[PDB]
Design a protein that fits this description.
- Chains A, F: It comes from Eastern chimpanzee simian foamy virus.
- Chains A, F: It is found in: Host cytoplasm; Host nucleus; Virion.
- Chains A, F: This is Gag polyprotein.
- The structure is a homohexamer.
- The first copy, chain A, has two domains: 5-80; 86-165, no CATH class.
- Helices cover 59% and strands 0% of the residues of chain A.
- The first copy, chain A, has eleven helices and no strands.
- The longest helix of chain A is centred in the N-terminal third of the chain and has 12 residues, at 42-53.
- Chain A starts with a helix and ends in a 9-residue tail after the last helix.
- The interface between A and E is medium-sized, with 25 and 28 residues.
Chain lengths: 174, 175, 175, 175, 175, 174
């Protein structure tokens, strides 16, 4: 199967120079790549990323580093950033919640933690924008069954609470 | 399938950088996109919209929102402007009437609006070019049975009126 | 079916800036567009014109008007010029006869007139190029029987009298 | 189907703006078009001629006028020059031997002449470059049997003689 | 078959000029070339290499030097550096380790040498950061059964040891 | 069958204006064309050539003189140089050894000239680099039988004598 690179490169654009932006730039372009061509197998997901980055024999992934589009961005994160100890997760998450959403922080944080709900939930409760948002979101998550459903229904509930107070993604008001 | 974006993007052009300008741009360029590539399933509608926007801007859709082009243009207007953005819908619909004319303004408004006849009708009634055009138009729209039937037969009724008074699209004299 | 827009737009070119020159240009480019890709159905013809003219909701066509190339050229005419009353056909037909020739003038004129022969025959005759051609053409038309077979055979007969006098499209002498 | 208008237009190049050059241009590019893509049915010949010439010149053909490349090259001659090709054959053939050399002029002069050998050979024989080429060339075209076999080998032999005397194809001295 | 060489030359770019920089350039560009198009047969690899260098006769491989990508790159190293290039391999590797770190050095180093584990491991024990990175790395490799196994599980182990100590790819402190 | 002129023409570039410089150019850029499209038959090779060179001075091959890429660069030389172009043939092989080295010049030479081992083998043995290379090459060439063998195993015997003296392409020490 011949991936159509000339089309995928009109959508996406040119990767940034400073290579600690490649992991975040590759999440914002994920939906648009799966528009031009429906990436299905781990194998294609590898091939498409290797082609888009190019002569970086550094950031070249494998069929193990690509089951979802989110395993991939963790594996480029830990190549361009380094491997953190658990007591440094808080600082990294605050970096992402600053540039992108609480929403981006949650998914990437859970990937870098081994899907540790207690830790990541605990850290993000410190960066939500305003006292009313914080208690609001907790009431919603407390009316669920187990800490498994709390994890599936977290992004859902944060977007609901944000609509009420009428905030955009980055916690600023519309 | 492969949505051939390089060629679709040659017809349309580059999407704008201001995210409060996308949902009009997606209404104007809809027939040109739907000309090049056929779109049946809501599935494919969502696939072209994401690719044509281009990721960098940060506005993306699901199959739920994309049942109909008009459905999907509305969703992004809400996501960029607020809920109940009735004041700005007004200013957007004004701006078009004063360059392209009352007919274009109707069509684009009923997209941004989510096909709210009652609302867009009201806003247009003010930018009509006459005291007489208004009362004549509204006398034909009253013999249509329902608000569904009025919304289908409005451009047809408006053009009769303009014809009889020798006005062009932009609502100035031909003669 | 995906329309090959990148090739149809190399054969054809960029449409004119002034939108009142679009109805004519699209007329005399149709043979090139039927070269690159054979448009059979109305549905396709609609799609190709929507993609060529591009982001310009306002000149967009339905697959109702786009039945034959000549039908869609008259439609785009009215959008860019504006509906006119019957007493002004005279000046519209004379205008086309002076840039384009009697063959084009006849088809568009007849199309804007619900295929009224008596009137469009009558006006054309007063712009033909000289006393020879008028009388020669009138004889060929009057060996015919139905006045319907006198309107299906008009262009065929006119092109033939122009060959034996050796005139171009417009009615200049080819030498 | 879609004819490869991309590839055929790479080889052929842009048509000349002056419309009395077109018929000889098409005549001399005909064989190259057949090289990239084999033209078979008359239908296809019309489709390629029309899509090459390109609308803004305004000379189009029907399927009837394109039985063979020679009927096509005749028709555009009569529309652009106004006289038949055989009215002045000795001046068109001289005009190509001054600008593409004898070899082109023969192949093209047999198109325009309707494959008359005993004439086109007689005209070319007068414009060959040198007294010694004439005699050499004739020697070889006398070993062949039929005036048909001569007409299929004439460019073989002529290119043999130019080699021995060491001339290029325009007819000048290689050294 | 038909290779897409236009696309494969956009991804890779334009090869360097000094031909002692070609072997390495082709080693960094293998995973992207094998992304675009899945090179399978040794024949295809040969075609794709001989196209990209595109007129540099001298570095032209046959299908006997082209089982895997690393065999081809080794060939071009010998044709530009000589037979036992064991000071130059030295200086290539030192340069890569200073600018990109030990893991991106081992991968390229092992391609150039033709997968000579015993020689490239040698060169890198000198460029590791600490007396204590060296010792730790070596212990885990000594647990593996044979030389082939160690070459597989080398970058793996290096990364584990760096993690513990608290270094990053380029071999500096993240604490 | 379609000949994809548009793609082949981007790989190769544009043929030069002087019709004397066309034969060497069609000899350099032969494997690049043999990359894009797989030429297989006389007929196809003849169509690809006439399409690339379309619109010069009656340089138009047939299926007879296109059995090999060599046959077609020979015949193009003669039509642009003359029936026996010896003096000129000498000057171009000498022009290539100065700038690119011996092997380039022997391979392009026995294209332009028609695989006459006994001419090019005479203009090359004057620019072999040293006294030691000459002697070494000959003992290998004279162990080969016939002469066809000594014209096809020449490059094989040259690249061995340059490995064991550590000479580069151009003929300097590495």
């Amino acid at each position: 199967t011949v991936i159509p690179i000339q089309h995928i490169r009109s959508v996406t654009g040119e990767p940034p120079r400073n290579p600690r932006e490649i992991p975040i730039w590759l999440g914002r372009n994920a939906p648009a790549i799966d528009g031009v061509f429906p990436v299905t197998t781990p194998d294609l997901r590898c091939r498409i990323i290797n082609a888009i980055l190019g002569g970086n024999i550094g950031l070249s992934l494998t069929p193990g580093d690509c089951l979802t589009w989110d395993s991939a961005v963790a594996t480029l994160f830990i190549r361009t950033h380094g491997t953190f100890p658990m007591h440094q997760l808080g600082n990294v998450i605050k970096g992402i919640v600053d540039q992108e959403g609480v929403a981006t922080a949650y998914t990437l944080g859970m990937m870098l933690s081994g899907q540790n709900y207690q830790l990541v939930s605990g850290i993000i409760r410190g960066y939500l924008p305003g006292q009313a948002v914080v208690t609001a979101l907790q009431q919603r998550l407390d009316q669920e069954i187990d800490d498994q459903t709390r994890a599936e229904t977290f992004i859902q509930h944060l977007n609901a609470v944000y609509e009420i107070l009428g905030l955009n993604a980055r916690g600023q008001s519309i």
